[PDB]
């Protein structure tokens, strides 16, 4: 039936965040901090997907005793949306199997969501310029497309120690 770009945006937003929660949960971590940020994360992601400015959604999982990345989960946005498609899906099966592959985490591994955007993006309250933790000595792995609504898609990958 009929759908709008905002429908596709909303589907991808909720399911990116659902997927990241699942990653946190299945990685053995407490999703409470992710819940505390759900509202802020939703508004930022939905806004920058709506304007086409969101490039990547990133979850750094770091060791707080050394401040170095243990692992990192990326969702790259693919802007291939079409008004005459209508199909949608979320593929979290592959995410589950990649969790062993991403690496052993410390008991109290902490996490932080970050958003990579085009320069001309609109401001979103509370979000400001930040910096990536180093990925030196880490290896990117790709899981292919894990969420799509009507051509707007998210390609998931993870970084492991090499």
């Amino acid at each position: 039936a009929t759908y709008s770009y905002t429908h596709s945006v909303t589907y991808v937003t909720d399911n990116i965040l659902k997927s990241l929660k699942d990653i946190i949960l299945l990685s053995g971590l407490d999703p409470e901090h992710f819940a505390d940020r759900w509202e802020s994360n939703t508004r930022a992601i939905k806004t920058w997907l709506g304007t086409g400015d969101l490039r990547k959604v990133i979850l750094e999982i770091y060791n707080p005793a050394t401040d170095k990345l243990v692992t990192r989960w990326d969702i790259d946005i693919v802007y291939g949306w079409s008004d005459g498609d209508g199909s949608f899906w979320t593929d979290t099966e592959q995410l589950k199997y990649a969790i062993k592959k991403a690496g052993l985490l410390p008991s109290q591994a902490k996490y932080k969501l970050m958003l990579d955007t085009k320069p001309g993006r609109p401001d979103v309250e509370g979000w400001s310029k930040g910096s990536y933790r180093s990925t030196d000595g880490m290896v990117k792995q790709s899981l292919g497309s894990t969420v799509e609504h009507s051509g707007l898609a998210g390609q998931a990958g993870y970084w492991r120690q090499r």
Partner: peptide, 7 residues
């Protein structure tokens, strides 16, 4: 450019 949330 990367964005992070500051409470």
């Amino acid at each position: 450019e990367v964005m992070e949330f500051n409470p």
